[PDB]
Every structure is written in structure tokens, then in C-alpha cells.
RNA sequence: GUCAAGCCGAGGAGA
RNA sequence: UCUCCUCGGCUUGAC
RNA sequence: GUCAAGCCGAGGAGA
RNA sequence: UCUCCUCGGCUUGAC
């Protein structure tokens, strides 16, 4: 029951007999449906060859991989062959080699396959190699750059193409090379500006995939322009005159404790170059050990935090933040005062506590919560009410905070209430930004809801922004955020319906219409880069391709040779590790051990004396001063307390450079793994 | 009159002079020829000696225990010493210590063992202490595994050997330890993916058993397997495109009843997943206390079993199974109605009754019955008629139902009937699944009956997998059921005939064959890895098993720390059940008392007041809601009547978190035992 | 020699 | 955490 | 089938 | 170099 369309022939049929290739094709093209027919007919006629047949196909998110599985792929072809998805989720329980040579067809995520080929070449495991496969196909090629996964994949296959180029000339006896094929909507512009370096970054794109030609519809493009439905477009602007009785008692805040450090940030309040000064301070007074400027560097970071979900979010959120680090702190003044007094931590509680009440009080005012939050209350409920039950809306914001108090605040609001709205805020797996992490069963679940209709509404981040295939989509908005071309193009791509939506909110002040037609003409110059290399001569985008696949080969090679080790100390124990809020001496480096070279822990009963606990098994570590050292944990039936770097600070024995690393691997000095020997009766 | 082979010399020659070993041979390779031999030389040897020679053989199942006894263990060693095997089915009317130091050789399950100790620990008992002996033997060493009986018992022997090693640096005397030995054919892989990971799990094995070596045969190997033939693999597949007119049926069924639900499973049908979302589902609505849910939740999970056994079985037996507890439910409401209207209950009623008769009528069609039935039928009769009277056929299912169903419908069939074939089911001794329990002297009986031939075709569980020693067997399968690598060469090892079938029914859509090949892949896996622990070194051999030895000892004592109370509450009355149907108040926390620190039980008239009893001494307990509650007994000449806590619902007096235990040790609360002076005229 | 009931822990498979 | 299966141990009772 | 924790690398955006 | 976001992989654990 496999189905096509002329303009899907048209672009797939140089690659029915070799032409390993590229396809770019506007979103919602059946670009899927075009790749299932092709592995259709490159697997019946290897089976005609009497030949192996192998087809893999790599997407960078697991969610393409199952939906891929569910959809598309698998019914149309599930009685022909044999078909599996892989996956982290998915436990790869048989292995994926025998698969390899199993079911005849693999979907995975990259590094699956490049693990089991680094795992080859380490020898640890039998593992993987090219000369296996007969066909790759990749989605989403555009993210094949300097050396993502993708190209790293590549790389391997280039540098085999370059042994096989010098055996032709050499040796008859040559490795067999499986067929390429890409596919993808915007191949993207490392901004280029130049339409020439557009130019150049396209036959980069080209060689990391050994792409003979982008191959793009011509003569069928017409009715495909006709098929393919593009939103409206529009844009929408609020000024932030409002927030004064609240965010000026911010700023009067922070004000304040400058002058408590008599310190010039020579920048304006709540914009990040603020809290970059502010990292590079704390670290400064971290490495000098000096007090009183990193605590309050790190509040003022907090502050400016504050201050930016205030200019996107309303105050509420900001002022609980506030309070819960700040209670935070307070817990842990009074652990440490149970085990057993401070100035500069006092006058920060002074100041902020009765502010804080203050703050609670001015907070819970809807005369001016926000300018750019009424106009999407405002224009939310003029879609959802002129849809009369055809709308799936689709919010796109910034971070965590901004995606779950909107919805919690959508489900507040009555007027939403009243169209019938039902909000649901959607991230991504890993925990972060002081909101519950959504597992990707919740992740699924929720994505299924929504189809369902159940959810009406979806806020979301970039997450949402690639994939998530919809039948139907009317309304598509994004919060004050925006990041490139790609993004807003495939944000723009989403809204699969004969009446499209596309809405803009953005704040006055802030340039983000100047993004917006930076992107436009980004969009508008790659289609012109694409007719030119589309119209090259065969022999000069040959030998270009070449040049940029030595450039590729020759600069991993480098990198390589750059960081064969790059650091090499082989000192066990030759630094002190002290406190960073507090210069207290923690331990040295001969108390530490390694367990699965996985944690760093330290075990003696000279640590154990020292830290505090931290209840709700994992149980988390903080200091003497207040400062968090690490957590507990379980292993081995050991109740080994583990640390982070991060929090502590370093003391060479021999000229005491005080420095950060942030992170273990940084380091170069090794750490002996922990044999468990002692610790026994 | 004993008998030895050059392979088993081989295998078992480090093990005659010390060398604690492990042993891992093919099936059918004389295990327990080598076992009986090597106890007769070292029970030789501590005579000439002149020291006590003690020997243990240790069993997880009593049927091996019985075999080992009557037919190679007894029989060759009955001249020259005692012997005698026990189990919970033998009567240890003597008990076990002296049986310690009567008999000289004892064959036993491990906890008879394991309980001996224990009451010495506790002192209730002299009991038995491992320095009595002088050798350990034990079968299916795989079965030691994190903390398995046979692990129990290795746990402390090295607790034992760990104070010895403590005392040789610091004290001459030293506790003995008697020779370890075990045997098995597969020490399997505890789903190590890596053949690292699985050499890891081998390592593990070795350090529970204080294994010194493999000792697999090498040399000699090759006339082993040249003596050993393995039986042709056969795989056999349908595809269930048939079942509409009445699966079908009982979807709509399921959709009306999910429509009155007015839920959304978010699954297909038939799948054990919807079945964990019900369970999910009524929990949640029995601690809400709500209604209309929960029993409907119950429904759709009998419903949900039916369709199963509808996939694996024809639709009668579901059928069957749907009317008899719609019958035992109609009863519960006639007596309700007897002591004295419901609106669920009635609707689920009507919607039955007539869609009841309906898929009677529709359950006697031979024309598509099933296909993965008629494939079995074809076979059967293929190997069968091909046999010629030589045919003793194995047929391995999953559950109770197919087991009996299966029996009954081949009785049932003409076909098997003109071939002679006499099937009859096997399961193990406890009673569930709506199935009678079949006795150990059933289980005994039909053994000896299929052994005799009597019993042409036996179809099993995985009872049937381990152990069941037969001299000749041309004719195994298995039917649509998978577990994992061990229990698929242990089914197939077990055709013990020049020509031998293995035979495989697997649904076209169900991923059998997936787990089919990595069950291949982990037995490939296995024996690199025993090649490489091997061809190990010593020395680092014994350190990794010392550390796996602690790893072991360590786990235990944490999971004793976290176990040593791990919930402390002496509340006795502070709780209050009512009703999981419905929301009656039943008893409290005061009214209940304890006999044998054994049963749970109320005696109070206001109990005896508001309960039904069901017919068929030991009538069952039911609620006024049609909730069944318990079963009377007579203990103490005392017609107490228990229940079981899972049927009831728990209501703290503090702030009644609703909640369900399913059972009665997970509470924390202790219960008083009944001082019986009361009802005393 | 046969049966019933109940309780304690363990393992494997699935999800 | 749920389901299915498997195990063996312990108590009580009856024939 | 569910959850937690930790680690490894990659990309994009900003500055 | 910092921040934000995104990814996927690996280990351990528990239910
Ligand atoms: N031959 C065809 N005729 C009509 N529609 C098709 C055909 N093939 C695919 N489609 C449509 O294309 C959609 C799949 O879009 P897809 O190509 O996955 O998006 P993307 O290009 O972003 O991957 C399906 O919903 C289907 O309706
Ligand atoms: N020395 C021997 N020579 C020939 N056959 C033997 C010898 N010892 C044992 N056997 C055979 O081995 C069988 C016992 O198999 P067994 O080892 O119990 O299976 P498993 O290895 O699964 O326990 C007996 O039927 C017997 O015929
Ligand atoms: F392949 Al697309 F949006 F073009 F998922
Ligand atoms: F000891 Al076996 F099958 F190998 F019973
Ligand atoms: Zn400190
Ligand atoms: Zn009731």
C-alpha cells in the first residue's frame, strides 16, 4: 500500500541508482515517506543482486527514532523485512551487532553506531564496521558540522574513501563503501554573510557527506509550492513601562549591596553581561580567598536572574525564587549552628527578609503584572476563541521557570479557563533550573495528549521546536525568544493547517525583529547559494568537495594531536583542596580514591567529622560555612560521600596558583581507584 | 560396579586433592556420575585417613533430590555407607543434626540447611555449624546469584574464611572449612551485555562459591562431543490475522465499558501494559475511595487476561473464565440480596449476560479457531505419525489454563486421538490461576507415567524446563514463550536422542525470535568469557574473587543495616479498616488479635454480625457489598474466621493517607497474640 | 500412604 | 512498582 | 513498565 | 571565557 508523489520521484530518483546524495525539501514534504521508499527499492534490488542488504538510519533524537518506528517506516514495511528502533530508553538488550545482522534495517541515534565502531577499535567488543552496511541514511543532515556526531561518522567514511582513492590508483583491491543519503529542510548557514561564504559553507555540508549534488525539485517544485500551505505571518510588540513599584525595588536592592562592596558593575541591571562581571568577580575573589565580594557576587547573580524572568515573567516567580534559595541558606545557617555567628550573611538576611515581605505584598497585583504577558493573554484567547474547538496552540519560551508558571498561571487565569484552554508545559529530561524534570515517559505521554487533543495547548522550548510530526496546527507563537534561521523556520514549519498562525512577542526595547530579518535574508540567500552549486560543473564541485575533506580529515587529525593528552601530570597527591565560600582546609589529594574511574570520593573518617547533612538515602553535603560540598551515595553498600569539584577550591603544594576548574576531567593529575580492602572489620 | 569416562577424570581430577572447584558440562554428560564418584574417593580418602568424612549434596529442587537418590547416588554407594535424601515431602522425623552425624552422606534442599543454622543462631535449636563438615556439593551453581539460598549459605562460609584469613597473620588456630564443589551446565549471564560485563558475572559466581577454577574439559572435550549430539532447531511462526468475529467482540466490550469509565488507557488491547495501567488505576480509585473505577478497573483487567489467553489459547477457555467469575459474582449479590440495588453492577450485568451467550455461540468454530494452534496441531501430528511409536513428546506453555485447555482440547481433538498421542498436563503444587493444584505425588506420579511411556505428550511449565531426566526424548517445543538464555538451553538440552527436534510457535507480531538470537549471542558469550577467566592469571584471579567475596559480604550487612527495623511503630490500635468495594467501616485496630504469631483474626460478634459465608468446613468469607473478605477456619476447635489485609482498606486515625498493603508483614504496626481466656461460657 | 488451608523467604521472565 | 511463572521452607487440619 | 543519582561527549543561542 | 538552552550516550541504584 506504499504510496508517492511526482516531486518526490523527481528529487529521489539519481539516488535509485547510486548518487549517494542530499534532499532538502520544505517540512511536511513526505520526505519520510520518500526515504521508506527508497530503502523499499535499494533492498529489493540488492535482494534482486543476490546481494546483502543493509540500511541504517540515524537521527539525533530518540523521539524521531520511535516516531519514525510507529508511523512510517515500520506499517508500510513491517511484512517485507525485518524492522527495530534503538535507543537509550529502548534497552538494547540483545546487542547491537547481532541486529547489525539481524533485521536487515536499524533506526538509531548516532553514537550508538559510533560507540560500537570506537569500542572496535579499542577492541574491547567484536563491535561494528562500514564495510558491513550497504546504505546510511541520516535526517536532519544539517547538524553534520565541524564535528558533531554526524560528521564524525563521516570522517571515518572519508578517510576510508581517501585510503580506497589511493588503492585505485595503487591496487585493484579496494573496501567496499555503502551508498549515502541525506535528508533535510534548511541545510543552514554558519553565518556566512558573504553569499559566497553561504556558498562555501554549503559544499562543506556537501563533502562532510560526500553529497554528489543537493538534488532539489525543479520542474514538479510548482505543485509541491501548491500542496504546502505557509502561515501567516505576525508580529507582535509591548514596551515594559510597567514594573516600577517592584523591579525598582530590586534594582534599590542591588544598589544597596554594591554599596555594601563598593563595587562598580559599569553595566546595566538584569542584562547577563551583568552576570558575567559578576562570574568573573566571584572567581576573582574565590582564587584571591577573599570574602565578602563572592558571597554577594553570587546574590547578585541570583538578582540579576531575578530580574530577567521578571522581564519576561511576572514578579511572583522571581520573588519565589528568591525565597527559596534565601530559606535554603537560612537551613543551612541553622545546621551549622547545630553542630556547634556572621556579619556579611547577616546583612544580607536583614535586608532581604523584610524586602521579601514587601515584595510578597506588591506581587499580587494584575494592573501591571507585565505588558508582554497581557498581549498573549490577549491574543491567545482571541485564536482560541475564533478556532471555536480547531485550535492547537503552541507557545514557545526560554528556560523551565518561564514554561511551568505559565501554565500553572493559564490554569489560574479564568478567561482561559472560560475559552475551555488546557495548558501544559513541556522540557526536556535533564533537571535543571530549580524545576521537576519530566521523564521521557512523561515526555511521550504528554506528546501523545496533545495529539489527542487533550491538550490544546503545549508551552515548550526548543525541545518542541524540531520533530514532534502533527497532523494539524493552526496557532504557532514564540515568548521574547529567538536564536537563529533554523530555529525560527522550523518553529514557523509546525503550524500543518490550511490557516496558519505565526505569532511574535517581543519586548520594545530589545532587538529581536532585527534576529527576525537577519534570519529572513539568511532563509532568502541559502535558496540562491543552493541554484549556484546546483548549476557548478561536476569536475570543480568534485575537486571542492575533495579540498574540503582533506580540511575536514586534517583538522581531526590536528585536534588530535593537540589533545593526544595536552596535560600530562602524573601526580597523585600534590594539592590541598579547601573550602570556596570559606578558606577552611577540606583534605589533600592521597585521601581520595575512584570508583569505576566514574566518582572522585574521599572516605576517611577526617571528612566524615567535618560536613553537615541535608534531608528532603541520597542525602546532600554541605560545609561548616554554609557552602554545599556534594551528596551521598550508595555504592557498593558503601555510604560514600561524593563531592563536585566545583564547590571546592585547589592549593598546589609547590606555588599555591589558587585557580577553578569547575570539573574533574579538566584537571590533569589522576586519581587511584579505590580498592576496598580496608574498611573491613 | 562404578563407572567413570576420561572426560569426567579429566574435569574432576583437581577437585580429588583439595582444589574447592566448580564444574560446567553439557547436559546428559554423567554430572552425577562424576558427583558420586568424586564423594566415594574423598569418603575413601578421610577413612584411610582417619578422619571424619561428612558430605553434603545440596538441591533448589526436591524432585532432583528424590532422583539423585533413587537412581545414581544410592544404588552405587548403598554398600559402603549411608545414605538418605531429604525434603519438606519427606517427613524429617528424625531430624536433621542427627542425620549429621548418622548417615555420613546427606542429600538435602539448601534452607533445610539454611534453618538448622539459623535456629543455632537464635539458639531455639542446637542446629548444625559448617565446621561439622568436610564437603559441600552443589547442583545448578548458576542459582547462586545476589542473595539466593545457596549465596546465603556461601555468605557466611566467607564471613568464615575471611576470620580465617584475619587469624593466619595473627593466630595459628583457625576455624576448618570444608571443600566446596559445584556443578551446573549453563552459570549464565545476569544480562551482560559487554563480554566484559558477562566475564564480571562469571568473576561473581567464582567468588560466591570460592571457586578456585572452571575446570571445563579441553582436552578430552572433543570425544564429549562427539558422545553428545544436539538436537535440530525447528522455528515455526503464524500469524493471528484471525480471531475478528469474537476478539473483536470483546474490544467493543472493552470500548463500551471504557466509554462508561469515561478513561483513556492510552494502549492497545490485550497487552499486560493495559493491564498494569488498570492496576494502577483501581489502586489509585480503592485509596480515593471512589467508585465506579476500581471495580470497572478489575473488570477490564479480566478482560484484559481473557484477550491474552485468547491470543495463546482458542476463546472458549476465556469464555469460561468470564462466566464462571460473572457467576461467582452473581452468587455474591444473591446472598447480599439473602441477608437483606446497584447501578455498576447491574450495568456490567446486562452488558454481559447477553454478549456472554452471544460468544458461546461464536466460541465452536474449528474454521478459525487460532492459527498458532493449528501449526501446533500440524507439527504434532508430523513428528507424530513420523515416529512410529517412538515419539516422546514435550510441550512447554506459560500459564495454567494453556496447560489444562491444551490437554483437554488434544484429548478433545480426533486427530491426536488416531494417533494415539496421550497428553496430559503438568504444573507446580500451588494452587492458582483457577486450575486444580497438582500434588507432588501427582507431580511423582505422572513422571514416572511419561517415563514409562504411558504418557506419550506431556505438557509443562517451566517446571518441565530444569531437571526431569529422561533416557530418551526425541521431541521438544515450546510455545509462544520466552524467558531468557538459561531456559532456552535447558529446554533444549533435554531431546536426549540420536535424532532430536526442537520446535518453536511464535506469533508473527510478537518479538520471540528477537529474544531467540540473543539468547544465541549470550551463550556464544559465555564460553569466550570462561575461556578467558581461564587463561587468567592466578593471582589476580584471587584478588578479583577476594574483592567480589567482600562486595558480597558488604551488601549483606547494609541491606541487615537498612533492614534491621527500617519501619519502628508499636501502635497496635490506631488504625481503622473498612471495605476496598466499598466504603464501610469494618473493624479497628483493638478488635484483632494473632494466633501462632501465624494468623490475623477477629472473634468479635460485631465481626460475626456482617459478614457472608459462600458455600462450596473451610467456607470463604464475603463482604454486603459482594467485597470478598476471608475464609473461615477451625483452629483451637475455634471457628475464627481470617482474612486477608489486600482485601481491605487502611484509615489512619491521625491523618488517614488511604493506602494499600496487599499483605500483612509490610505493615509496621505489631498485633497482639490471643490470650484465649475469654469466650469462656 | 492421601488431602486441604494458611504463612515465610528466594529466584527467573516481563513490563 | 505491577503482572506471570518457579522454587523450597514452616505451621495447622483432616482422611 | 516506573523512578532517582551520577558521569562522557556534541550542537545551537547569547555575550 | 561565561551564561542559557538542546541533544544523545554510559554507569549505578531503587520501585
Ligand atoms: N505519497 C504521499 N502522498 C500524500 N501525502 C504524503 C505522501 N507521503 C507522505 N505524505 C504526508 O507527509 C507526512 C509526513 O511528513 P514528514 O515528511 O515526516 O515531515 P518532515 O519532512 O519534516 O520529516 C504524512 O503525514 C503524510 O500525510
Ligand atoms: N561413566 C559413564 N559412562 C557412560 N555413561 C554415563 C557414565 N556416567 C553417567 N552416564 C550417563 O549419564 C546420565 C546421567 O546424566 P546427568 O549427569 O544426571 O545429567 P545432568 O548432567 O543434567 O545432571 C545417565 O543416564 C548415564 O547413562
Ligand atoms: F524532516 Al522535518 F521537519 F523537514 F522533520
Ligand atoms: F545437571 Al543438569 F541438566 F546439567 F540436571
Ligand atoms: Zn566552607
Ligand atoms: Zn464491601
Redesign the interface.
Known sequence: ELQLRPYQMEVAQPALDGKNIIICLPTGSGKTRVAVYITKDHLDKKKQASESGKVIVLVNKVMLAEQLFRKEFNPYLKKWYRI?GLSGDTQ????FP?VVK?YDVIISTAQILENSLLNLESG??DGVQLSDFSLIIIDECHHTNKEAVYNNIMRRYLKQKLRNNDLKKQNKPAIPLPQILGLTASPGVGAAKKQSEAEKHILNICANLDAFTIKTVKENLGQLKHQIKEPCKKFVIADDTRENPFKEKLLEIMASIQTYCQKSPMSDFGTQHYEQWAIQMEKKAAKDGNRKDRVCAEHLRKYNEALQINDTIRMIDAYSHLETFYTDEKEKKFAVLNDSLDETDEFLMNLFFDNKKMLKKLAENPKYENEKLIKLRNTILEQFTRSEESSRGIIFTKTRQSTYALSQWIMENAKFAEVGVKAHHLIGAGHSSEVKPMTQTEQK?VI?KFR?G?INLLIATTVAEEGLDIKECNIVIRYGLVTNEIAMVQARGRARADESTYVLVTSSGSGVTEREIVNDFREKMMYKAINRVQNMKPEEYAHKILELQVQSILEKKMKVKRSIAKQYNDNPSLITLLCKNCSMLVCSGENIHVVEKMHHVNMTPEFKGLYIVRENTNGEIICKCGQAWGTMM?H????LPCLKIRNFVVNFKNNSPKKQYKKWVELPIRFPDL???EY??
Open positions: 527495530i538494547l538488550k540483545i546487542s547481532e539481524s574491547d567488543d505521554e501523545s489527542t487533550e550508595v557498593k553498600g558503601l555510604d580498592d576496598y580492602s573491613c572489620l
